[PDB]
Write a protein that binds this ligand. Structure first.
Ligand SMILES: Nc1ncnc2c1ncn2[C@@H]1O[C@H](COP(=O)(O)OP(=O)(O)O)[C@@H](O)[C@H]1O
Ligand SMILES: Nc1ncnc2c1ncn2[C@@H]1O[C@H](COP(=O)(O)OP(=O)(O)O)[C@@H](O)[C@H]1O
Ligand code: VO4
Ligand code: VO4
Ligand SMILES: [Mg+2]
Ligand SMILES: [Mg+2]
Lengths: 584, 584
């Protein structure tokens, strides 16, 4: 509930560092206290000012006493407002710092979590949650913190004052009033919360549908599907509006009940006071006093019945953000993991059995050894699952059984960072940042110099194409570089991995989008650049890999045939069939 | 400014076809008027109740007179709240309907706009603006509409009452108070707005950067670049927080000045009233009367100073939404465009000159004719720009000069819908909706039956693969189909286009991710399905298109060679070189 959320948020407000920020909170609390004391004082001055005017005076009738007391009243009101604005000004920095640290922590945690949480994740939910939560925590914190506590202080103070100045039927009346108020408010809020949860869930679903439609604009255009999308959005919007109408009607009923109770209590107290006046026990200033005290007390509470809905939503949103921060990490490093030390880059697969889900096993005891410095190819027909090999090597997931070794070391027992530092990959579908081509190429290593980018662009055979562009390296690619052709994007990917210069390199359909001459050029660069590293090339078109040291042919998640190109042509098996057929 | 935004928004509030809602708005305004009248009346009753009890009495001036008037006071207070909540409950339906129609209009317009918009922007900004704006308009409409107009009514009424009951020094004093109030508020708000616009732009930029970081999770993982993104986000967040601190300081100063003016005016009025009382012109009830009137008047205005920031941001966002709605459409249908009639599907290109930007011309007077029913291929090396042809054919852009005709008809003069209805395309990068495989295949034509999907899945040679999946047609595939292999995605794309059954079909490197046997299979299906349509196949690997009726070879935006496969091999030109090289 909300109480747990606030208890979780409380450590951020009173940090255990920054000795400077801690003092400001104390000062702000002191300002709050002075403001309350002044606003509490001013009605006693008003009551006495009224008392003086009627039934004689002490020096002069009203020339001096009435003027002095009216000016004291006005100056008091102004002083209270001044203190309130001063507390706001002093406090605002602590809040800004607290929310900045919350945002930074959530961002870091989201980058640390496992990919399986990224494979099915809607863009709209994450973006909406972070934007909404930052705005939410600022609004909720200010309204919550600075319009509830002083009212409690004033309620206790008023109880004390009634104690000191009257008989205690007033005390019993007010205590019963507060008890009724709390019980009624709680039961109504309980009824209201289920409908609130339903409304919020429907809103989130509608927004995610809308974003997916907008994100697939090309496909919606190709098939003329505009009307279908419009109807699909319209239905969700109507359902949401209905739920909202029910929610606000219940809010209105709760507000009417609360105002009835409050005004009943005021009626009763004023009546008892006038009855007491009839017997000559009390002056009429007592009447003015009680009236002013009650209205001053109840103004902050009546203010709230029109900011309720927002505060509620804010509290929900903050709970949501903590929920996101709490989800656990599926794949983590072991305790005290040693660093990876790569001296001779052999690769061993030892009886690896794996699948994404327990109901579909994909690899069936695949074992093989890739010798250091050798050039090997991995081929198979479609659906083979060869792209898992690579995804497993980077430890995006762990094997159910068996193990992977690099230089004789179990990759489950080493640090993730050294492992991924030792490996380079060129994937099938490469994504570009929304920035210049020069930034995208320099991204491979921290601080890439002009010489490294020039060398890589030469090795990638894109130098002339860039030279003929008007803006050169500053040509914008757009979103996912959708402004560049496929061969251009694949060349940028090759350049990136060239800039990394990793000891072990993986080509994952690296050449599939290029023309023949470009292909032969980059293939020659790849052969030259492979001098003393382990290179694994996964290719569809066999002619580009026929000179490999060894070829692994996978079918249906297992190793069907293994050996050199000549051995497989002699065996007359699957490889021979594939190659012969393709040649014709 | 805000005034223009509100004037634009007002037609949504007072509709013109339902008529049911129009009566409800009238009823709500009537309730507002009753509530204000009651809250205005009850202080006169209080002043008189005070006047009766002191210095005389009509009958029994101790219990009967005082009880009736205090009870009337309490009942009046309660009745005002009751009317206010009743107006809220009655009005709530109109707001929901208005915001629903606004959202629907923005969605439809966003779908109608030109592609060059989409390819220039970030997903996060548009999603943020639509979510933020709907929440913004609802909150702003409620606060704006129901906490400003009654204060104007009350101020005029109080002016009238002072007129009727006193001499007009009070009137001039209030007039001067209002004039000073408005002038001060305007000039301070003017200073504050420049800082506000900067704050908002900085926030938008930071959020866009964050979303692009999250959207490129794979690449950021591949290069261990987490620290760079964390620092990059952190700096923007600090800049934003600084700007926010300046803004709130200026708001605090404005609030203090306003409260000073208000409390000075009350001081003066009550002082003058006491001075007048000293001469016996006025009873003591007058003091309470004036005090209560002023406090009741100013209580709604003191509250606004703590909802100001929110309303301001809301108004900004509502302006933003209309700005988006107004942007003009680059490519529009001509007036009275006739429908397309496809009787003989020939395609003519007539001297088409085009480029994306006026500083880089890509096609240099390309002209050609594709005869109805022929099988033509378009080939070239990389960067050729052959991928522009299709985008031009669908009229995503217009030619600078020349024209394209189908059956002889200028495509610029026909309706966009009939034109795109006659064309099918299989693009290089195919996008999947976040849903099941069956939904994605059935999407090609509205209401697609089970027989058509079965026939298409057979023709695409994916039936066995789907049969071996546990959930079959109900298999989830992620978003952008990132869960499927490349061959699977390309097969789904082929199936969609087969489901459309268009008379003209374009294969844009359709066979690129498949193995040899799958390729030969689908190539046979295509050949069979091509019987009486025009088919244009753009292919990198020449062997797959050697049997075409004719092949067009493009280089650098021009036609290098044209003719049948044997003619080009005899010519010993570019085609011969490319083919020979690839074969070896
Ligand atoms: N995220 C995933 N969730 C569930 N199944 C998956 C996922 N990714 C891949 N699969 C399965 O992995 C196989 C694809 O492996 P892959 O090596 O990419 O084949 P290909 O080389 O033809 O692209 C498919 O059978 C697919 O169903
Ligand atoms: N949307 C675009 N905006 C700016 N330049 C573009 C855009 N699309 C293509 N270009 C340029 O067109 C050429 C590649 O276009 P394309 O037709 O895809 O060639 P190809 O057929 O070889 O893939 C490049 O020069 C590219 O910069
Ligand atoms: O997308 V292309 O440059 O390969 O024709
Ligand atoms: O679908 V694949 O065989 O190209 O990775
Ligand atoms: Mg694969
Ligand atoms: Mg291309």
């Amino acid at each position: 509930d909300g109480w747990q959320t606030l208890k979780r948020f409380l450590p951020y407000l009173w940090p255990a560092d920054n000795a400077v920020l801690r003092r400001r909170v104390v000062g702000a609390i002191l300002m709050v206290l002075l403001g309350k004391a002044t606003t509490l004082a001013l009605p006693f001055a008003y009551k006495k000012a009224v008392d003086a005017m009627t039934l004689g005076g002490g020096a002069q009738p009203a020339l001096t006493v009435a003027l002095a007391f009216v000016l004291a009243y006005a100056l008091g009101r102004f002083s209270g407002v001044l203190f309130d604005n001063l507390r706001n000004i002093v406090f605002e920095r602590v809040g800004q710092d607290a929310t900045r640290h919350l945002a930074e922590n959530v961002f870091a945690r989201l980058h640390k979590l496992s990919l399986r949480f990224h494979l099915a994740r809607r863009t709209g939910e994450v973006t909406k949650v972070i934007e909404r939560g930052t705005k939410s925590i600022d609004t909720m914190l200010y309204f919550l913190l600075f319009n509830i506590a002083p009212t409690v202080i004033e309620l206790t103070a008023v109880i004390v004052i009634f104690w000191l100045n009257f008989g205690l039927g007033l005390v019993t009346a007010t205590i019963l009033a507060v008890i009724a108020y709390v019980w009624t408010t709680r039961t109504i809020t309980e009824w209201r919360t289920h409908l609130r949860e339903k409304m919020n869930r429907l809103d989130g679903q509608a927004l995610a549908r809308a974003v997916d439609s907008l994100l697939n604009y090309e496909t919606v255009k190709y098939f003329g599907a505009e009307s279908r999308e419009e109807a699909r959005y319209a239905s969700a919007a109507r359902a949401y509006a209905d739920a909202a109408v029910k929610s606000e009607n219940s809010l209105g009923l709760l507000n009417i009940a609360q105002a009835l109770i409050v005004n009943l209590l005021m009626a009763g107290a004023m009546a008892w006071t006038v009855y007491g006046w009839s017997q000559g026990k009390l002056t009429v200033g007592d009447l003015v006093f009680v009236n002013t005290y009650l209205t001053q007390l109840f103004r902050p509470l009546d203010m709230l019945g029109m900011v309720y809905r927002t505060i509620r939503q804010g509290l929900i949103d903050m709970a949501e953000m903590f929920r996101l921060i709490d989800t656990h990490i599926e794949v983590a490093d072991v305790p005290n993991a040693p660093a990876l030390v790569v001296n001779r880059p052999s690769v061993t697969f030892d009886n690896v059995v794996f699948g994404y889900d327990r109901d579909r096993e994909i690899l069936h005891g695949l074992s093989f050894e890739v010798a250091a410095g050798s050039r090997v190819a991995i081929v198979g027909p479609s659906g083979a699952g060869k792209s898992t090999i690579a995804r497993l090597l980077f430890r995006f997931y762990d094997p159910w059984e068996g193990r992977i070794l690099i230089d004789g070391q179990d990759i489950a027992h080493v640090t993730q960072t050294s492992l991924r530092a030792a490996l380079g990959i060129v994937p099938q579908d490469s994504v570009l940042f929304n920035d210049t081509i020069g930034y995208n190429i320099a991204y491979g290593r921290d601080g890439a110099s002009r010489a490294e980018v020039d060398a890589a662009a030469k090795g990638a055979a894109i130098a002339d194409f860039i030279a003929r562009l008007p803006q050169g390296y500053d040509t914008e690619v757009g979103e996912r570089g959708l402004k560049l052709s496929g061969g251009e994007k694949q060349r940028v990917a090759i350049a990136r991995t060239l800039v990394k210069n990793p000891p072990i390199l993986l080509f994952d359909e690296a050449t599939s989008a290029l023309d023949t001459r470009t292909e032969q050029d980059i293939l020659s660069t790849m052969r030259a650049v492979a001098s003393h590293r382990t290179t694994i090339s996964i290719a569809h078109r066999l002619s580009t890999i026929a000179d490999s040291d060894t070829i692994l042919v996978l079918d249906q998640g297992r190793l069907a045939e293994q050996g050199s190109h000549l051995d497989l042509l002699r065996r007359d098996g699957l490889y021979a069939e594939m190659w012969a057929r393709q040649a014709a």
